[PDB]
């Protein structure tokens, strides 16, 4: 182990946090499927495969560092919200808490003098000043829709074709 | 149009198959720790395979006008007493899902939901070769007892599963 047990613990908690991001985004699908937004569910669903691919990268990095991963319990996510906005609001806060979480690991890793993990985390800070700019954009759109259903379908149908 | 009862049983089965993906990944976090990348690679294909099963239960529960509810995922075990002790846990885990499919297959045939019955039959099959992949490994093991030599032959071979 060239990592410190301190930085590998934090990289391990971050692996656990995105697994839960993958479960919470899947759960927002179950709601969006339930309320008939197939395109909003499709998107959440692929936001869940994307957070899982992030966990893989954390997973493998821990092991090349020399360390080992330990998985923790996943607690049951919210299943129902107050509407499309309330759900996509929720994706926005969660995509902000993880933006802050990855700031602490970034710091922590520079405080620890870990030049590699910092560099490795370089891609994730950028990755997620995108992702939570997308989500806010999403929510700023369904506002001016104003419950006008014509253009919510328009957004369902458009986020529904993210590949 | 699924009944509430047939729904409930498929919703639990979906949450059980998710725990299986998680358990097998956890088993992969023990295997790379102990230095077997083939066995860990093999557990990683399996978990992601359990995932796929759990999204087919998913699209089906919405084809029939139901909704998935996602329950809490218990913490997996993280250590066992060796490779065969883990693949021991493997076989037993997927013997129990195999009997939990049958009970749904009954429950739905009594329903008489002929639609969920027919679809489970894909799983009943695919599930009754999942155990046999694990069954022969446990014995591909057991006769291995030791000879870390062929255990390493084995780990190499398992490690190329796609």
Numbering used by the authors:
A (entry chain A): 2 to 164
B (entry chain B): 3 to 164
Question: Could you share sentences copied from the article?
Answer:
We made a mutant named FLAL where Asn147 was replaced by aromatic phenylalanine (Phe) residue to create π–π interactions, while Glu112, Glu113, and Lys114 were replaced by three hydrophobic residues Leu, Ala, and Leu to decrease the electrostatic repulsion and increase the hydrophobic interactions between two adjacent dimers at the same time. Therefore, besides calcium ions, we also investigated the effect of PEG on the assembly behavior of FLAL molecules because PEG is a hydrophilic nonionic polymer widely used in many biochemical and pharmaceutical applications due to its mild action on the biological activity of cell components. After trying different molecular weights (PEG1000, PEG1500, and PEG3000) and concentrations (10, 20, and 30%) of PEG, we finally obtained nanorods formed in the presence of 30% PEG1500. To determine the structural basis of such nanorods, we set out to grow single crystals large enough for X-ray diffraction analyses in the presence of PEG1500. The crystal structure proved remarkably similar to the design model: protein molecules connect through designed π stacking and hydrophobic interactions in a side-by-side repeating pattern with adjacent FLAL molecules antiparallel with each other. Thus, the crystal structure is in good agreement with the above results observed by TEM, confirming the side-by-side interaction manner of dimeric FLAL molecules. Taken together, all these findings demonstrate that our protein interface redesign approach yields assembly of dimeric FLAL protein building blocks into the filaments or nanorods induced by Ca2+ or PEG rather than the inherent Ca2+-mediated 24-meric protein shell-like assembly.
